[PDB]
């Protein structure tokens, strides 16, 4: 039953970028806790492996995987045809190579969503596209000298959906690439919903954290790979060196835990009464720190979680030329608004950043510990 | 000669929208000043009609015609101006605005890339959009710090409204082209040099609505003015015109333009603010300042109220929203080009308005 009170019709759900760390968790609650049907598009399933046929047949004929690459891939526009709903999650999303394959990172993000567009819009589907907090880019505050009060008023800094500015970098801040292209991309549906009737959604993730986030590089991964913080730290708690802080890790973020997040999404499956149309944040106001903070917390849980206690200094400051490269530039606080959310869905983050850390800290042990030990 | 000292040899140029404002003024410049060749792609040729009996032009629109890239490999330097550019349908066809500044751009820019040609894009100063200081207080001092409103090309921010505002349709276009020519030139070794207009004023911009174009059209403030004066109606002012821009003279801009052709060594690689810090106003201004030189220029006097306030809603439609203040760095473009404006905000007008009036008053007259 859905919030209006009408009952839930079921759905065959085109998902792109399915096999991926949002992707993958979808797919759970969507089996788990729903009656919809699930049409997975990806190039790889390792993550959502545990819920195929071979693997298992307790979801046979409610999940189906399709080994598909969306740059150029005919059987697609059926796929789409053959389901009620797309989700497009299907992007480079790592901060890493913004900056180092530009050009990539711009085809991703932007070029390559526009056939998912095309076909939802004429086959009038109902899209849900995922963009990132990264549109809204930097904080108005951030332009304000240091300590200036003005930095206190929630003015500067909360970022509102319907109002607030996409600030981003100059041209050669190529990590604003991928800012640009979401950006675009967000206008692009928002129009064609404007200038054709198109049915959509657009989820702006603030920081979900969780399992299967990104990669262990050497693992799961490669080596020379550099992904999201979550799994940058990981790494370093597992191979028990210190915690890499970019530039002193004083940029601040909110972390929402990602099964929180989830429960989102699935709002707006279930309610398009009340999610068409709209921009959402979705994010955990409250699990605020810095970077350096992150660390220092991330560092307390893995203690806890591991037995095995400190390391002598945990972390060390490192340049972002000698890290992320040429032209990085920063997203310098994220605090998401929830007037938006809150007032069409009724969402709200249950869960804690110390719990949602004892949480994916301890499948990140289990998973990863005996494995990095044989290396 | 060039400014390196070097001599300049000649060049076929592959120019694209050079039947626009700014194209057939750098077609003039190029003509006569220079030993350049043009080949002149458009859908129109109307503003080049006068120059039309080195330059060839070939009617080519650029959405799909497989002539393109033969045409590319033709010339030596490629200049694409070819651009939906009206903020007046960047909310009300903001697909075909976005399809126009980012994704018909892109095969130009695979084609230069490819073939070792020298890429000039067109972008704009809206690029910026807002400017930083637009988010203090109503006359907090910081303000005045130029901190927080000069638009330095190489740091300063793009700001843009939200979603919902329609009108960074077009801004966004712009920045993702200019992020991804930036990227080829990084990535692949595209030889490139980014224009950033800040509001040129002058000669065949844009049209007059019923003479030069459609009744219902909106174009620039200044055709939209040229319009008012003529047609003797008061000058519609959006939400009371108070944002401010700094127009410079198109002749001033062309002359920067010329200087990049001719002077690779210094300008591949870089973006260029061109426009005129010295000629600021607020657009009340520059229709009081309008009216002012048109009364001289026409010989007829004032207007009993000669202009009017008018909402946003009523004027530009739905999600209107509006670059604040412009006015251009000049450090970048000083320091490698040595260039600068001449021409004054008031002689540009007397310039402008005297060819508008010799051009449109039997016309007008006669409807
Ligand atoms: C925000 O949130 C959204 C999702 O984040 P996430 O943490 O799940 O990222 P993720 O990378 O873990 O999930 C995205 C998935 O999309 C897939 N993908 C990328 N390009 C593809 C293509 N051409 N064809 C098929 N699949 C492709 C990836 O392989 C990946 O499995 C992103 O769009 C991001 O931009
Ligand atoms: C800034 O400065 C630049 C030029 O400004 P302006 O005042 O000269 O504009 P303008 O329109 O006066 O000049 C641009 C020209 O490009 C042409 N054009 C547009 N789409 C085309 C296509 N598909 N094929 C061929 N020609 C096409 C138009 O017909 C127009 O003549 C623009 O890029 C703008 O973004
Ligand atoms: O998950 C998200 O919602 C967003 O995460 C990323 O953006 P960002 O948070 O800026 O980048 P991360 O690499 O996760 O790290 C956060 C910040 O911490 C710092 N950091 C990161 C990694 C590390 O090892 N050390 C470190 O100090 C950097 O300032 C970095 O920008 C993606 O760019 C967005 O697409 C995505 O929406
Ligand atoms: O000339 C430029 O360099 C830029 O001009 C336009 O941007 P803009 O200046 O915002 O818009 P205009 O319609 O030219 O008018 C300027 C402002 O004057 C006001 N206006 C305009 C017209 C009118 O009749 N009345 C009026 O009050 C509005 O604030 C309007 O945005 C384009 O957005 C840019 O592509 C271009 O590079």
């Known amino acids: 039953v859905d919030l209006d009170g009408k009952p839930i019709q079921p759905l065959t759900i085109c998902m792109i970028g399915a096999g991926g760390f949002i992707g993958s ?40 995987f399709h ?10 526009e059926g796929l789409v045809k053959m389901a009620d709903l797309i989700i497009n999650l299907a992007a480079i999303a790592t901060p ?36 990132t907090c990264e549109v809204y880019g930097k904080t108005i505050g951030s332009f304000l000298p240091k300590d200036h ?22 041209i050669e801040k190529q990590r604003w690439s991928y800012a640009c292209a979401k950006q675009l991309i967000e206008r692009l549906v928002y129009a064609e919903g404007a200038e054709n009737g198109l049915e959509f959604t657009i989820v702006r993730p603030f920081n979900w954290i969780g399992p299967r986030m990104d990669f262990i590089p ?12 979550l799994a940058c730290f990981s790494n370093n708690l597992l191979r028990r060196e210190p915690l890499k802080l970019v530039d002193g890790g004083e940029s601040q973020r909110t ?33 605020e720190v810095t970077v350096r903070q992150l660390a220092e917390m991330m560092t307390e849980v893995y203690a806890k979680v591991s037995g095995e206690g400190a390391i002598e200094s945990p972390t060390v400051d490192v340049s972002s030329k000698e890290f992320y490269g040429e032209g990085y530039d920063d997203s310098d606080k994220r605090i998401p608004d929830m007037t938006i959310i809150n007032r069409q869905l009724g969402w709200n983050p249950k869960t804690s950043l110390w719990d ?6 301890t499948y990140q042990h289990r998973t990863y510990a005996e494995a990095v030990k044989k290396a």
């Open 25 to 64: 968790h979808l797919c759970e609650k969507l089996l788990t806790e729903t009656p919809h049907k699930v049409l997975a598009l990806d190039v790889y399933n390792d993550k959502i492996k545990h819920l195929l046929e071979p693997d298992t047949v307790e979801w046979s004929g409610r999940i189906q």
């Open 67 to 76: 080994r598909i690459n969306i740059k150029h891939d005919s059987r697609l």
């Open 96 to 131: 890493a190579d913004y900056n180092t394959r530009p050009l990539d990172t711009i085809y991703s993000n932007f070029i390559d969503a526009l056939p998912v567009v095309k076909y939802c819009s004429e086959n009038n589907k109902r899209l849900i596209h995922f963009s």
């Open 149 to 170: 009060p003005l930095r206190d008023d929630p003015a500067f800094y909360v970022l509102k959906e319907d109002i607030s500015p996409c600030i981003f970098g100059s």
């Open 218 to 229: 050497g693992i799961d991964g490669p080596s020379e790979g550099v992904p999201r913080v």
């Open 255 to 287: 972390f929402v835990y990602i099964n929180d997040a989830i429960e989102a999404v699935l709002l707006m499956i279930e309610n398009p009464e009340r999610a068409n149309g709209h921009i959402f944040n979705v994010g955990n106001p409250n699990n």
């Open 356 to 361: 949602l850390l004892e949480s994916t800290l």
